[PDB]
From a paper:
The non-LEE encoded effector protein B (NleB) has GT activity and inhibits NF-κB activation by transferring N-acetyl glucosamine (GlcNAc) to host death domain-containing proteins and to glyceraldehyde 3-phosphate dehydrogenase (GAPDH). The glycosylation target is an arginine residue, which was unexpected because the guanidine group of arginine is nucleophilically poor at physiological pH. The T3SS effectors SseK1 and SseK2 from Salmonella typhimurium SL1344 are NleB orthologs that behave as NleB1-like GTs, although they differ in protein substrate specificity. Here, by using a combination of X-ray crystallography, STD-NMR, enzyme kinetics, molecular dynamics simulations, and in vivo experiments, we show that these enzymes are GT-A fold retaining GTs that most likely follow an SNi mechanism.
SseK2 was solved both in its unliganded form and in complex with UDP and UDP-GlcNAc. For structural analyses, we focus on SseK2 because the data-sets for this protein were obtained at a higher resolution, with three different snapshots of the active site. SseK2 can be divided into three types of sub-domains, namely the catalytic domain (40–147 and 185–336), which includes the Rossmann-like domains, the protruded helix-loop-helix (HLH) domain (148–184), and the C-terminal lid domain (337–348). The C-terminal lid domain is highly flexible in the absence of a ligand. Therefore, the electron density map for this domain was not resolved. In the ground state of SseK2, the C-terminal lid domain is highly flexible, impeding its visualization in the crystal structure. In this state, the donor-substrate binding site might be fully exposed to allow the access of UDP-GlcNAc. Docking of FADD110-118 was only possible using the SseK2 structure with the C-terminal lid in the open conformation, since the closed lid precludes access to the binding site.
Numbering used by the authors: 39 to 160, 166 to 183, 185 to 263, 265 to 340
Write the structure that this text describes.
């Protein structure tokens, strides 16, 4: 209807992400004291001019909301500096991770382990190792959830887990935060999430994505899913909910193959009848006006 793309036996409609679809950048800052107490606490050096990259994108995308999704122990002056950015560029909206409620996506670690123990009493060495070690995991802070444990890391896991959850909320994250001037967002709408290390050279316009989703792929003989661009047309996109179900069902993280990636591949090709390369070709986010990792 806006066309289709077929993959692994299913025809996926190409769906539009129009100007109502906001851009989102994330900055989770472990050491906010490295910035001035009244400065914007986002790196903006010659080498990594990330704030400038974001401002440029906001200027170019004059008809779109630009989100800056942040976390960290910012000072009041830093919060005020972020506020001033919002006044100066009327489409820029700062969203603090503090202000968002993710409890609908959370789960107690005990529940996960019990479910695992129950299944794993019902073929292999892997399983018996799995069973003992999970059993062990339970015995150990009993109120802990996925959120509370990730709340303890201030590293990549903290960033990644919250990026992924944000993407489940999509445009709703702006509404939930109560941001001014967000009347054009579609409730239940998506977002175009971007690494701040990028150059936008001109307007994106409307994107047409298979089932409304696409991801950064890097390509010399090799190809890989990358996490610098994730675009979705709607909140709680089912391919992302798949990743969440995986996180909800598994005791242990896998560092190279994250749950977002695993969920995408599982949703689009649970069987793996097409190779990784074919999946990469299918899902790839490609736009001539974006240059990734300029720095």
């Amino acid at each position: 209807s806006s066309g289709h793309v077929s993959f692994a036996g299913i025809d996926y409609p190409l769906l539009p992400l129009n100007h109502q679809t906001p851009l989102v950048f994330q900055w989770f800052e472990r050491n906010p004291d490295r910035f001035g107490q009244n400065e914007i606490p986002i790196i903006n050096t010659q080498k990594n001019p990330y704030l400038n990259n974001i401002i440029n994108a906001a200027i170019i995308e004059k008809e779109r909301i630009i989100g800056i999704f942040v976390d960290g122990d910012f000072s009041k002056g830093q919060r005020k500096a972020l506020g001033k950015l919002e006044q100066n560029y009327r489409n820029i909206k700062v969203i603090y991770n503090s202000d968002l409620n993710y409890s609908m996506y959370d789960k107690k670690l005990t529940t996960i382990y019990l479910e695992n123990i129950t299944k794993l009493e019902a073929r292999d060495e892997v399983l018996l190792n799995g069973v003992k070690k999970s059993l062990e995991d339970v015995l150990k802070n009993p109120e802990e959830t996925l959120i509370s444990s990730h709340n303890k890391d201030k590293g990549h896991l903290w960033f990644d887990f919250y990026r992924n959850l944000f993407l489940l909320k999509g445009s709703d994250a702006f509404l939930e935060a109560g941001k001014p001037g967000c009347h054009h967002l579609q409730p239940g709408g998506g977002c175009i999430y971007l690494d701040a290390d990028m150059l936008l050279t001109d307007k994106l316009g409307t994107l047409y994505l298979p089932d409304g989703i696409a991801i950064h792929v890097s390509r010399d003989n090799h190809v890989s899913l990358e996490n610098g661009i994730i675009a979705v047309n709607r909140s709680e996109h089912p391919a992302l909910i798949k990743g969440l179900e995986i996180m909800h069902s598994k005791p242990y993280g896998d560092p190279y193959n994250d749950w977002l990636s695993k969920g995408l591949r599982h949703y689009f090709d649970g069987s793996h009848i097409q190779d990784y390369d074919a999946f990469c070709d299918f899902i790839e986010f490609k736009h001539e006006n974006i240059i990734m990792n300029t720095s």
